[PDB]
Amino acid sequence: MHIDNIENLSDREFDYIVVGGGSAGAAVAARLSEDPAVSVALVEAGPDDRGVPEVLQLDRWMELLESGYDWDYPIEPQENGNSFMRHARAKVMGGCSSHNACIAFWAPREDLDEWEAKYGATGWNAEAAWPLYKRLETNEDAGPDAPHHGDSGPVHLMNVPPKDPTGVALLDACEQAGIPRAKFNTGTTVVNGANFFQINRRADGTRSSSSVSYIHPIVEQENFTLLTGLRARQLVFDADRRCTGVDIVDSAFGHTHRLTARNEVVLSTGAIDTPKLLMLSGIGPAAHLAEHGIEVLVDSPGVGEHLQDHPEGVVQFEAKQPMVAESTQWWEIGIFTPTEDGLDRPDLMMHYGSVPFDMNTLRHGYPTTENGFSLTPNVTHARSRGTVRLRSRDFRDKPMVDPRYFTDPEGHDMRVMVAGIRKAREIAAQPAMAEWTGRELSPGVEAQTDEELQDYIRKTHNTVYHPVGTVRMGAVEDEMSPLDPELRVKGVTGLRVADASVMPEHVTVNPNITVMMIGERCADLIRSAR
Numbered sequence: 001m002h003i004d005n006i007e008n009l010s011d012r013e014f015d016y017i018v019v020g021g022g023s024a025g026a027a028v029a030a031r032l033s034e035d036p037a038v039s040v041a042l043v044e045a046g047p048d049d050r051g052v053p054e055v056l057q058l059d060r061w062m063e064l065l066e067s068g069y070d071w072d073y074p075i076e077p078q079e080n081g082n083s084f085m086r087h088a089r090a091k092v093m094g095g096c097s098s099h100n101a102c103i104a105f106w107a108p109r110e111d112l113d114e115w116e117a118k119y120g121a122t123g124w125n126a127e128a129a130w131p132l133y134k135r136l137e138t139n140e141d142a143g144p145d146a147p148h149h150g151d152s153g154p155v156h157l158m159n160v161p162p163k164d165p166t167g168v169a170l171l172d173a174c175e176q177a178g179i180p181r182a183k184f185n186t187g188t189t190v191v192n193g194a195n196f197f198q199i200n201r202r203a204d205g206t207r208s209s210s211s212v213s214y215i216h217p218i219v220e221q222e223n224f225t226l227l228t229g230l231r232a233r234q235l236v237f238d239a240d241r242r243c244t245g246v247d248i249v250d251s252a253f254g255h256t257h258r259l260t261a262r263n264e265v266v267l268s269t270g271a272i273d274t275p276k277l278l279m280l281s282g283i284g285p286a287a288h289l290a291e292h293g294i295e296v297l298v299d300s301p302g303v304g305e306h307l308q309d310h311p312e313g314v315v316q317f318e319a320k321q322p323m324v325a326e327s328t329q330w331w332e333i334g335i336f337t338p339t340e341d342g343l344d345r346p347d348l349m350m351h352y353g354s355v356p357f358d359m360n361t362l363r364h365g366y367p368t369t370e371n372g373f374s375l376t377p378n379v380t381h382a383r384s385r386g387t388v389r390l391r392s393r394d395f396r397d398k399p400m401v402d403p404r405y406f407t408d409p410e411g412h413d414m415r416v417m418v419a420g421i422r423k424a425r426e427i428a429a430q431p432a433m434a435e436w437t438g439r440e441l442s443p444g445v446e447a448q449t450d451e452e453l454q455d456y457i458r459k460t461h462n463t464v465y466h467p468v469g470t471v472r473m474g475a476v477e478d479e480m481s482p483l484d485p486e487l488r489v490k491g492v493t494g495l496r497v498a499d500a501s502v503m504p505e506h507v508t509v510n511p512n513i514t515v516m517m518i519g520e521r522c523a524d525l526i527r528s529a530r
């Protein structure tokens, strides 16, 4: 049953509570709820997504940015970046899977294997991720000639139909440049290749959010409870240090009620909010909890540390012909290409947008258009690391988000971005794009030296919106990993984190589906007891 007002709930005791019904949370709730003996509560701050159509309908997605469905987290001033950047974060069931561009990717096997081998995450590798990626999808490419794909899973993945004439040409220009067409999600990582994406979206136009995919169909289920418009402010523990529940609130200035957990709590409030909530609950770097008068329950110096993203740049063009006026999601093509020899993963990616993207350029006096396209290079494995810290001990204050863009001491992320800009310029200048490529609007042909292009990037870069790493897994000996390999918070019991926070290292690709995968795994971990 769905509860929109906490007063209607008479039992606040549950076997499992899952906080935050986003990409991972929904999934873990949906899966845990499959044993009908066991009871499950899933608590989210945003509202229900059913009958909301700015959320349900994918081609509308961009309209959600900065709306009442976005938490809207601006960043701290940047040493070497764009101080006007906002990390949009969906606030609604399905979380960011309800506002994202639905671009769907298996993570590369070399990303996931490195979790175990390079980063201490025992049991986190491809053998583990592969049967789960399988389970979560109903993929168009399923067949005997692609047995790695699942055919009956909740999240519908479809191939984007190659209809955009500029899209098709951009590919033709890509071939001309040394970038072949590749199939996505075949099991073999794409290093140098490009194509129309797969997307997680149903036949009708409705996105395949983790809420549309996992929750909707189980709403009326006997053992499962959906609490929405409820915000968590604290986790609650024992003299034994077993997590017993969570305190939540009906409007911010309204009251505080406690749901209690017989078995476990799962935090799935994502890369920005999970570390906040843990710190408000006494779990983090001690000196920092001391700074704000939060009493320390566990000194865990790694909470809110290791913030990772895909920084994004942009290169904008005037179209010589008219652009498409309908799309799946306006960003239909992706391009991988290495900048360096010897990599088993591309260090550079570019999306293609059949629209302008003047979010960060307008305020800087760069001219625009209503008829053009964009090329958006991103660093797939940035070496900059940042933080999420508390602004105060007040749960209502937004956290301080400081990804510290382009601060890696080697100057690598800047170097990949500079090169990405150059490459996008190169792709567009190709003969298969003579009929389309017009005048370059930003940064404008004017900018040519490493130095000029750097300045443009520092001013005008965005994010692809993939913040991760902030409550990371790792070895049991590693003091700097808040979680052990089975997703349990150290120094406490009965508490696990399951969302983008847990990544020891970013993945190469748009991470949503990988986050959905993580929830699946956590579900399997929890329900493997025993």
Ligand SMILES: *Cc1cc2c(cc1C)nc1c(=O)[nH]c(=O)nc-1n2C[C@H](O)[C@H](O)[C@H](O)COP(=O)(O)OP(=O)(O)OC[C@H]1O[C@@H](n2cnc3c(N)ncnc32)[C@H](O)[C@@H]1O
Pocket (backbone or CB within 6 Å): 019, 020, 021, 022, 023, 024, 025, 043, 044, 045, 046, 088, 089, 090, 091, 092, 093, 094, 095, 096, 097, 099, 100, 101, 102, 103, 104, 105, 230, 231, 232, 233, 268, 269, 270, 271, 273, 277, 464, 465, 466, 467, 498, 499, 500, 501, 509, 510, 511, 512, 513, 515
């Ligand atoms: C937001 C964004 C991200 C995005 C994207 C475009 C935008 C604008 N495009 C993507 C794409 O095309 N393909 C892809 O692979 N990823 C894309 N993303 C990023 C991706 O969507 C996210 O990385 C992924 O969604 C992360 O999921 P995660 O489970 O880690 O976090 P979440 O989805 O944001 O879920 C958190 C939920 O919990 C609620 N919440 C937050 N705080 C509280 C409190 N205190 N109490 C109760 N609930 C809380 C949030 O509202 C959210 O629903």
